[PDB]
Design a protein around this ligand. Structure first.
Ligand SMILES: Cn1c(=O)c2[nH]c(SCCN3CCS(=O)(=O)CC3)nc2n(C)c1=O
Length: 500
């Protein structure tokens, strides 16, 4: 009674189900920032090219170490170096350092949470370790950026189908810069450039008095402590995927696939090696660098390499997703939102693939935010969610036998107002169209587990196709929502319509 349906042991997982990876190589649609010819297990990857190369334009990340990063003109990189190469002994020292190259935000950025964490949460020995060891080591890896990220990083802009593969070490240098708020043109509230990109600098983690900010900082300093002490050796791939041809859902003759549904476990622990869904905001990462702390933000905190997607990933349009392969888990946690707490450091035991990427694949798909509950049953909105999930699950050019199951849950069903029973069925239909099985976590809701299982077995036993089910959703809208909360609920309607 803890789980229902297909045993999870029968679901496909990476690496066992994967196909031989092609040779890792840069191309028109794949940026590779390391020496592939020297990539070896257990060895820190060598950056390619050897000497720093800069691009300062509207198609690439504006690096803080660029000679074009100026301030009315002096070199901002020189200023960052002078500011950060000072001894920190009190939190005000770190605030003052960050503001030396952010003078325009000195009356706008609040540092209360950073001050409280250092002075009021940490004990004396933990504070001493922070400013004697961790922060100086973070400064050093940040300032090493021009020797580490030698190759320009393209923006993954809207409508681009493009991948970036970089080393975990390169990500660590970039995230250290984000912590010290060094990325230029990413700060103004009323900016034109980068207005369609998420925040990357960490200044909003330092503001306010929530009991959540200290837990976020503990989680991030756990990561920073680990990666400055011993450089991680693997790679991470970021792929923006934007599809043009979407199924004619009413006409899809594909059958449903297999389902495992359970009210215990988590996507990240029990969906190891599966395609793990991030319940994303259209600005990937949501409020990770500010106040948010539900499913997406938590994943971005315990696997912080996800955070760097915000440096270069434009806001997702309706037909797009972001696929990240290779991020490592550095922390364990309990709770969520107001009960979230950092638990301990985590030693990731995931195998690495032939590109030295952890066998962990996460897809960010953003559900819609519904102001009115009945809005989500409008056909245009159901099709939208179907196509979003389909884009996140589809892998053009891969046999279904080589596709892991999808590990997911009540996507968009918290603050975004989604109906769990509808969103479960939508994901089941999208997974079926993408020829993937579904592993579904209901997060303690045993009744929902039973309901999803019952509907899935009902539909499969009667051999209903994807299109058969979609037309029942359309019928539900017309008969119970269009001219209407509804008088009859969705699953009861479906049972009655089919049994009729
Ligand atoms: C399947 N699944 C979750 O659903 C989940 N939620 C959170 S934190 C936000 C709480 N909330 C969001 C949607 S909900 O309201 O439907 C139920 C719970 N962490 C989660 N993990 C690790 C997970 O595996």
């Amino acid at each position: 009674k803890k789980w229902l349906g297909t045993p999870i042991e029968e679901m496909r997982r990476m690496p066992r189900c994967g196909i031989r990876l092609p040779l890792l190589r840069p191309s028109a649609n794949h940026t590779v920032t390391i020496r592939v010819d020297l990539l070896r297990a257990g060895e820190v990857p060598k950056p390619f090219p050897t000497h720093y190369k800069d691009l300062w334009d509207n198609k690439h990340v504006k690096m803080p170490c660029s000679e074009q990063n100026l301030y009315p003109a002096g070199s901002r990189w020189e200023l960052i170096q002078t500011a950060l190469l000072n001894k920190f002994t009190r939190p005000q020292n770190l605030k003052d350092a960050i503001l030396k190259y952010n003078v325009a935000y000195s009356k706008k950025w609040d540092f209360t949470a950073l001050i409280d964490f250092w002075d009021k949460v940490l004990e004396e020995a933990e504070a001493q370790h922070l400013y004697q060891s961790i922060l100086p080591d973070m400064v050093k890896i940040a300032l090493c950026l021009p020797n580490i990220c030698t190759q320009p990083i393209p923006l993954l802009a809207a409508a681009m189908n493009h991948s970036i593969t970089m080393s975990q070490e390169q990500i660590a240098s970039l995230l250290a810069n984000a912590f010290f708020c060094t990325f230029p043109r990413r700060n103004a509230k009323m900016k034109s450039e980068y207005s369609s990109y998420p925040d990357i600098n960490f200044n909003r983690l330092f503001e306010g008095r929530s009991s959540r900010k200290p837990e976020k900082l503990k989680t991030l300093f756990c990561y920073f402590r680990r990666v400055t002490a011993a450089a991680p050796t693997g790679l991470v791939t970021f792929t923006r995927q934007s599809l043009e041809d979407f199924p004619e859902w009413e006409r899809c003759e594909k059958p449903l696939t297999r389902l495992h549904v359970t009210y215990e476990g988590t996507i990240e622990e029990n969906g190891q090696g599966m395609l793990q869904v991030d319940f994303a905001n259209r600005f990937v990462g949501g409020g990770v660098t500010s106040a948010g702390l539900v499913q997406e933000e938590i994943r971005f905190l315990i696997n912080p390499e996800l955070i760097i997607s915000r440096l270069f990933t434009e806001v997702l349009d309706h037909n797009e997703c972001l696929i990240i392969t290779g991020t490592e888990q550095y922390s364990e946690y309990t709770g969520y939102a107001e009960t979230y707490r950092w638990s301990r450091s985590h030693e990731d035991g995931s195998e690495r693939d032939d590109w030295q990427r952890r066998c962990t694949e996460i897809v960010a798909i953003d559900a819609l935010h519904f102001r009115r509950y009945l809005d989500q049953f409008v056909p245009e909105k159901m099709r939208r969610e179907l196509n979003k999930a389909y884009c996140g699950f589809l892998r053009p050019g891969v046999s279904s036998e080589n596709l892991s199951a999808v590990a997911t849950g009540n996507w968009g069903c918290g603050a975004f107002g989604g109906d769990a029973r509808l969103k479960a069925l939508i994901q089941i239909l999208a997974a079926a169209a993408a020829e993937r099985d579904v592993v579904y976590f209901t997060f303690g809701d045993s009744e929902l587990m039973r309901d999803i299982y019952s509907m899935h077995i009902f539909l499969t036993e009667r051999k209903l196709t994807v299109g058969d089910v979609y037309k029942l959703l359309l019928r539900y809208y017309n008969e119970e929502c269009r001219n209407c909360g509804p008088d009859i609920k969705l699953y009861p309607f479906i049972y009655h319509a089919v049994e009729s």
